Design a protein around this ligand. Structure first.
Ligand SMILES: COC(=O)NCc1cc(-c2sc(-c3ccccc3)nc2N2CCC(O)CC2)[nH]n1
Length: 184
């Protein structure tokens, strides 16, 4: 089912060009926005990291991790192994804060590298997604454009007043830029 994505990506994502690259960010973010619209998240952060990794953080409830009765996998693994973003990423990581626990899993091309495991304790809730778009699939470019992300971020915040959405470019550690939107 997921190899179907990696082989016919545009049928899911729409071209493998730059707009396709940026579509990835919006898929994860839209999801965080759902968490806000459901009334739990009020802080969303997007970071462009070295290597053009992308990180997205919200403080919603965190993707569920309970064993989803049917195959015996944590719901979050079940969900991530249906994520187009995961499928079109050469590496993807997730961290869930839930039940005062930090849960972690990593993937390659949508394939789980190991079982979901607890890697810490926390007094927060929420989800962290870090993914690195697949170079094999996004030829042409794998470099995110700041302006493009920023404009969409701004609309998204104005569309969802009361939700703080922060964008930050860390691809140059000596020169770090951030914009943060929070409309009353
Ligand atoms: C896969 O990566 C993301 O989409 N990350 C953004 C995100 C998603 C969620 C949550 S919390 C939750 C949830 C649902 C029921 C009860 C408690 C929490 N469900 C989700 N989504 C639902 C849609 C799926 O595509 C991804 C996971 N929090 N942050």
């Amino acid at each position: 089912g997921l190899e179907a994505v990696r082989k016919r990506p545009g049928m899911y994502i729409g071209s493998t060009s730059e707009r396709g690259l940026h579509h990835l960010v919006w898929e994860i973010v839209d999801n965080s926005i759902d968490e806000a619209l459901a009334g739990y998240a009020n802080q969303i952060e997007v970071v462009i990291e070295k290597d053009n990794w992308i990180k997205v953080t919200d403080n919603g409830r965190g993707i569920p991790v309970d064993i989803q009765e049917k195959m015996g996998r944590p719901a979050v693994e079940v969900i991530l192994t249906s994520s187009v973003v995961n499928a079109l990423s050469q590496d993807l990581e997730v961290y869930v804060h839930r039940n005062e626990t930090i849960y972690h899993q990593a993937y390659k091309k949508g394939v789980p590298q190991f079982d979901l495991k607890e890697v810490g304790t926390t007094d927060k809730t929420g989800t962290v997604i870090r993914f690195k778009a697949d170079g094999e699939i996004f030829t042409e470019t794998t470099v995110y454009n700041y302006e493009t992300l920023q404009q969409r971020i701004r609309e998204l915040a104005f569309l969802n007043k009361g939700i703080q959405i922060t964008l930050r470019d860390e691809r140059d550690e000596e020169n770090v830029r951030e914009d943060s939107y929070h409309y009353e």
